[PDB]
Subunit: 48 residues, 3 copies
């Protein structure tokens, strides 16, 4: 029973980690988009 | 004993992973702040 | 055998996670470089 509960806890931790990574990927993509947009502004500005 | 040492190693790996993720979140936040600041400069420049 | 296969699966998941984190670090570094370059452009532009 003890090893079962140990393994169960570990797999709970992994699923939580996998979701943390998912959130990090989300925020990383947004940041990439924003920085691309921000650079597009500059590229628009240096033609004004 | 073998399974104990296996589980122990796995939980050592998880704690290390959790800290890696922590460091990634730190650097991601800094990068977001810097990019916001960098864009704020531009927004300041196109009013000069 | 069951616990062995469980532990084996968990360690497979950890290696996959470690590589996901590796890819995230790669993309995070690139993004930092690009944002630095993008800001360098602006710093070049406001001297023209």
């Amino acid at each position: 029973y003890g090893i079962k509960k140990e393994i169960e806890a570990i797999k709970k931790e992994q699923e939580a980690i996998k979701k943390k990574i998912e959130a990090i990927e989300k925020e990383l993509r947004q940041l990439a988009n924003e920085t691309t947009q921000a650079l597009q502004l500059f590229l628009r500005a240096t033609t004004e």
